Amino acid sequence: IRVFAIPPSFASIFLTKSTKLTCLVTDLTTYDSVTISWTRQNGEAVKTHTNISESHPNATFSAVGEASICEDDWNSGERFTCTVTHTDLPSPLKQTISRPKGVALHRPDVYLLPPAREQLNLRESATITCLVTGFSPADVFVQWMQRGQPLSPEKYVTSAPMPEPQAPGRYFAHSILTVSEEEWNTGETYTCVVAHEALPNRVTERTVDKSTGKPTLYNVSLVMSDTAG
Amino acid sequence: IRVFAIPPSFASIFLTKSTKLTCLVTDLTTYDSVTISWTRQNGEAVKTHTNISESHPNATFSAVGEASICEDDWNSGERFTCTVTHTDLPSPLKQTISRPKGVALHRPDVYLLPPAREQLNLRESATITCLVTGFSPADVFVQWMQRGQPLSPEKYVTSAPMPEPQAPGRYFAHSILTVSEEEWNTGETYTCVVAHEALPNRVTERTVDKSTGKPTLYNVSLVM
Amino acid sequence: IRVFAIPPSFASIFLTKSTKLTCLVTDLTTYDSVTISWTRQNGEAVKTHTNISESHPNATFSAVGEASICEDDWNSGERFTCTVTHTDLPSPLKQTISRPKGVALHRPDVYLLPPAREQLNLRESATITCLVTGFSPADVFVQWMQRGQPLSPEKYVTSAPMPEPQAPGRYFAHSILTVSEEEWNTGETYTCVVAHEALPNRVTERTVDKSTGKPTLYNVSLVMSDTA
Amino acid sequence: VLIPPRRRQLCFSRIVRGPANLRSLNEFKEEILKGAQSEGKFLGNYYKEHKDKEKALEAMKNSFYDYEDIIKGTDMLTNIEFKDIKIKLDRLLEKETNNTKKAEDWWKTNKKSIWNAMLCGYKKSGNKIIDPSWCTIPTTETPPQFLRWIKEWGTNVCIQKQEHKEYVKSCTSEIKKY
Numbered sequence: 001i002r003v004f005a006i007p008p009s010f011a012s013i014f015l016t017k018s019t020k021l022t023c024l025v026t027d028l029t030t031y032d033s034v035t036i037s038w039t040r041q042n043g044e045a046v047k048t049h050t051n052i053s054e055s056h057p058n059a060t061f062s063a064v065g066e067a068s069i070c071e072d073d074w075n076s077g078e079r080f081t082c083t084v085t086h087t088d089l090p091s092p093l094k095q096t097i098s099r100p101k102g103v104a105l106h107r108p109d110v111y112l113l114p115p116a117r118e119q120l121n122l123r124e125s126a127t128i129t130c131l132v133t134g135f136s137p138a139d140v141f142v143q144w145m146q147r148g149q150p151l152s153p154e155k156y157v158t159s160a161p162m163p164e165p166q167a168p169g170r171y172f173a174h175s176i177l178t179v180s181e182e183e184w185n186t187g188e189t190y191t192c193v194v195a196h197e198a199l200p201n202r203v204t205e206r207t208v209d210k211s212t213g214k215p216t217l218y219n220v221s222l223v224m225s226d227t228a229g
Numbered sequence: 230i231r232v233f234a235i236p237p238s239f240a241s242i243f244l245t246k247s248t249k250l251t252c253l254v255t256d257l258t259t260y261d262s263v264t265i266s267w268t269r270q271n272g273e274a275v276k277t278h279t280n281i282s283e284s285h286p287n288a289t290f291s292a293v294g295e296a297s298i299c300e301d302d303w304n305s306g307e308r309f310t311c312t313v314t315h316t317d318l319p320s321p322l323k324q325t326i327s328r329p330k331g332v333a334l335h336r337p338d339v340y341l342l343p344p345a346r347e348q349l350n351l352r353e354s355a356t357i358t359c360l361v362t363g364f365s366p367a368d369v370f371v372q373w374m375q376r377g378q379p380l381s382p383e384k385y386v387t388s389a390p391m392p393e394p395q396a397p398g399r400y401f402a403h404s405i406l407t408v409s410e411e412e413w414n415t416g417e418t419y420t421c422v423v424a425h426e427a428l429p430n431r432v433t434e435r436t437v438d439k440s441t442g443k444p445t446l447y448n449v450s451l452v453m
Numbered sequence: 454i455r456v457f458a459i460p461p462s463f464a465s466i467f468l469t470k471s472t473k474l475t476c477l478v479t480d481l482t483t484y485d486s487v488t489i490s491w492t493r494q495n496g497e498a499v500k501t502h503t504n505i506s507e508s509h510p511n512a513t514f515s516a517v518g519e520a521s522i523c524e525d526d527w528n529s530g531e532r533f534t535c536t537v538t539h540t541d542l543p544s545p546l547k548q549t550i551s552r553p554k555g556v557a558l559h560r561p562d563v564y565l566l567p568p569a570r571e572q573l574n575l576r577e578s579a580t581i582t583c584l585v586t587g588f589s590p591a592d593v594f595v596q597w598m599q600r601g602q603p604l605s606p607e608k609y610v611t612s613a614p615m616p617e618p619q620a621p622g623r624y625f626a627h628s629i630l631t632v633s634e635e636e637w638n639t640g641e642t643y644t645c646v647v648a649h650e651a652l653p654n655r656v657t658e659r660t661v662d663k664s665t666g667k668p669t670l671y672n673v674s675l676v677m678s679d680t681a
Numbered sequence: 682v683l684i685p686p687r688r689r690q691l692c693f694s695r696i697v698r699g700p701a702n703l704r705s706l707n708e709f710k711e712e713i714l715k716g717a718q719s720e721g722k723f724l725g726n727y728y729k730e731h732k733d734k735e736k737a738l739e740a741m742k743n744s745f746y747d748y749e750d751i752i753k754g755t756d757m758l759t760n761i762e763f764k765d766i767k768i769k770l771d772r773l774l775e776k777e778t779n780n781t782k783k784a785e786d787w788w789k790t791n792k793k794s795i796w797n798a799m800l801c802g803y804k805k806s807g808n809k810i811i812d813p814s815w816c817t818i819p820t821t822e823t824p825p826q827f828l829r830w831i832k833e834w835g836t837n838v839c840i841q842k843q844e845h846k847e848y849v850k851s852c853t854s855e856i857k858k859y
C-alpha cells in the first residue's frame with residue numbers, strides 16, 4: 001500500500017552516468033503485472049518500467065518503477081511525482097521528490113594519507129586512506145583507481161559522510177584501500193577519484209606512491225683526516 | 230507493543246564506568262501509569278528506574294528505564310529481561326537482551342596517520358586520524374588526549390565501525406581529530422586511546438608527534 | 454544554398470556543461486515557411502527552438518534552434534537532422550549530427566612535465582607543460598587549475614590534437630602554461646585537467662608542484678687533504 | 682586597462698602570495714605586510730641614481746595605494762592579487778576573530794594604514810632622508826586616487842610618456858617610433 005520514492009543519489013547519477021528514478025512499494029499484496037509510473041511537472045509519460053521484482057515469500061510485493069531522464073531537468077529543480085495505479089491499491093498515492101535546494105556548495109578537500117610505517121612492518125596489508133573533508137552537501141562518491149583502471153569495490157570501503165566538528169554545514173568522509181605491502185613497496189598509482197557537486201569539474205584525484213614525499217636524503221660523507229698539518 | 234531494549238554499548242561501559250540500560254519501546258496506547266522494570270533469571274530485586282520520557286504525540290511512545298548491573302554479570306552474558314507493564318496491556322512486555330557470544334576477540338591495531346603534507350601546507354588545519362582496524366567485536370570507543378589532557382567529544386568524530394574489506398570477520402573504524410596547524414607544529418604528541426574488549430588491558434595508546442615519521446634527512450659520515 | 458550542421462564537440466559540451474545543438478545555413482537567403490526540427494530515427498522532433506538568426510548579407514545565417522539532450526543519448530548516434538523546407542528548394546535538406554562508432558576509444562595518458570631546471574636557473578619565468586598522449590578521438594579539452602580555481606584560457610595555449618606517427622590510432626596534444634619564477638618557487642600546485650571522451654571518468658588530473666621533481670638522494674663526499 | 686609594472690614592483694612575501702593561509706593576523710599578516718620592507722628597492726637599486734630623488738618616493742606612493750587596493754578590490758585579475766586568496770587570507774582571519782572587523786571596514790589600510798610606509802626600505806638601502814612634505818604620501822591620505830583606474834594611468838605619463846617626449850626633444854623614424 002504505502003509507497004517509497006527514491007531520489008537519485010550523487011553516486012547513482014555518477015556511477016552509471018545516468019539518472020535512475022526508482023519507485024518501490026512495500027506492504028503490497030502480490031499480484032501479476034503491477035503498474036507503477038512517475039510524473040513530471042508537465043506530466044509527460046514515462047519510459048515503460050521494467051525489472052520489476054518478483055513476488056517475495058513474505059506476501060509483500062515490491063513494484064519498482066525506473067525511468068531514465070536527462071540530468072538537466074532534475075538539476076534545474078523540476079520536481080517528479082510517483083503515482084501507483086493498481087486494483088489492489090485502494091486509491092492512487094502521490095509522492096513528490098525533487099533535488100534538495102538551499103544548501104551552500106563547498107569544494108571537497110581530498111587529502112590522501114599513505115599507510116603508517118607501523119602497518120608496513122606487519123607485512124600483511126597496507127591501508128591507503130583517502131580523506132575527503134570539508135564538503136557540503138553530504139553526498140560524495142569516492143572511487144579508487146590503479147594505473148588508470150578502477151579497482152574493485154571489494155578492496156576499498158567508503159565510510160558514509162558525517163558532519164565535521166569545526167563547521168556545521170561541512171562534512172567529511174573516508175575511503176580505505178587495503179593493499180598488500182608488496183603491492184605498495186613497488187611504486188603504484190592508487191589514485192583516489194572523488195566526485196562531488198561543488199568541484200569545478202565534479203571530480204578530483206590524488207595519487208600516492210612510495211616515492212610521494214620521501215624528503216631528500218643527504219649523505220654527506222666527508223673524510224677530513226687526510227690533513228696532517 | 231514490544232520493547233526494544235538496548236544493551237549497554239562498550240562506549241557506554243567505558244565512558245561512564247557504569248552499565249546503564251534502557252527499554253525503548255514501540256507503543257500503541259500513548260500513555261499509561263505503570264513504569265519500567267528489569268528482571269533477571271535469578272529473580273533478584275528490580276533496580277530503581279527514573280526520568281521516564283513524556284508522552285509521544287505520534288502514539289509511538291518510547292520509555293527509558295535505567296538500571297545498575299554488575300559488569301561481571303553482564304560479562305558472563307546471562308540474559309536480562311525487561312519487564313514493562315501498562316494499563317492497556319496487562320501482560321508484561323517481557324523482552325530479553327544479552328551481549329552476543331560466540332564471536333572471537335581480535336585485538337585492534339591502532340595506527341595514527343599524521344596529516345597529509347597537502348594539508349599542513351595550507352597552514353589552516355591538521356586532521357590527525359586514528360585508524361583502528363582488525364577488531365572482531367563491533368564495539369569500540371576511541372578517545373583523543375592532547376598533551377596529556379583528554380579532549381571533549383566535540384573536537385573529534387569517530388566513524389562508525391564497518392566490516393573490513395579483506396577480512397570478513399574483522400572490522401575497522403576511523404577517528405579524525407582536527408587541530409589548527411599552529412598547534413600541530415608545536416609537537417603536542419596527540420595520543421589516541423582505543424577501548425576494546427580484546428585488548429590486554431582494554432585500552433592501548435598510539436601517540437603521533439610532529440617529529441614522528443620524519444626520516445633521517447642528513448646522514449653525516451665523519452670518517453678519519 | 455547548403456546547410457552546414459555544427460555538432461558541438463566534446464570541448465564545447467564540457468565547457469558549456471550542456472549539449473547545445475546548432476546547424477547553420479550557408480549561402481542561402483531567408484525565405485518564408487522556414488522549418489527547423491531536430492529529427493532522430495524515432496521521429497520525436499518535439500524540441501523547443503529559440504533565438505532564430507536573421508538574414509546575413511552574405512546569405513549565411515544560422516536559423517539556430519537549440520535543444521538539450523543527454524550526452525549518452527547522442528553518443529548512441531541519434532543522428533539529429535534539422536529539416537529545412539525552403540521555397541527555392543522544395544526538397545527538404547537533411548544534416549545528420551552523430552558520433553561515428555568506428556572511431557576507437559583510447560584513454561589519454563596525460564603527463565605533466567615540470568619546468569626545465571634551465572628555466573628556473575635563469576630566473577625569469579617557468580613554463581609548465583602538460584603532455585596528453587594516447588587518445589584516439591581528436592576531441593581533447595585541457596584546463597589548467599591553480600590552487601583549485603580554473604585559470605583563464607589566455608594564460609595557456611593548448612596545441613591542437615595532431616597525429617602521432619608512432620601510434621597510428623592515437624593522437625597527442627600539449628598545453629604549455631607559463632608563470633613567473635617568483636610564482637612557481639612560491640610552491641603553488643598547478644593541476645592539468647584533461648577532459649576526454651574515452652576516459653573512464655571523462656576527466657583526469659595531474660599535479661605539478663615546486664617539489665614534484667627533486668633529487669631524492671644527495672650523495673656528496675668531501676675529501677680534503679694537505680699534500681698532493 | 683593597461684597594467685603598469687605593478688605586477689613585479691609589488692614584492693609581497695611568499696606566505697601571502699602563496700597558497701598557504703596565515704595563522705594569525707596580529708602576528709603574520711602583521712609581520713608579512715611589513716615583511717614587504719623589500720618594497721624599498723626603488724631607491725635601493727633602481728631609482729638610486731636613474732631619476733631624481735623625489736620620483737623614487739613618488740613610485741612608493743603608487744605602490745602604497747596599490748597595496749591598499751590589493752587588500753580590497755583592485756583590478757589585476759590574478760589568483761595571487763585579485764580574484765585571489767590573499768584578499769581571502771584577510772577575510773578568513775578576521776572572520777575567524779568573530780567578525781571583529783571587515784577587511785574593508787577596518788584594517789583596510791586605514792586602521793593601520795601607516796605600516797612603515799615603506800620608508801624603512803627606502804632608508805634601508807637608499808639611506809636618503811625623507812622630507813617632511815614627502816613623508817605624508819607614503820603614509821595615509823584621504824584621497825584614494827580612484828580605484829587604480831586613473832592612478833596607474835596617472836603613472837603612465839609620469840614616466841612612460843614624458844621620458845619618450847624628452848628623448849624626442851633630444852633617427853626620425855625612431856622618433857616616429859614613439
Ligand SMILES: *[C@@H]1O[C@H](CO)[C@@H](O)[C@H](O)[C@H]1NC(C)=O
Pocket residue numbers: 219220221450670672674
Ligand atoms: C651513504 O654514504 C655512505 C658513505 O659515503 C655509503 O656507504 C652508502 O652506500 C650511502 N648510501 C646511499 C647512497 O644510499
Ligand SMILES: *[C@@H]1O[C@H](CO)[C@@H](O)[C@H](O)[C@H]1NC(C)=O
Pocket residue numbers: 217219448449450
Ligand atoms: C647512513 O650512513 C651510513 C654511513 O656508513 C651508511 O652505512 C648508511 O647506509 C646510511 N643510511 C642511509 C639511510 O643513507
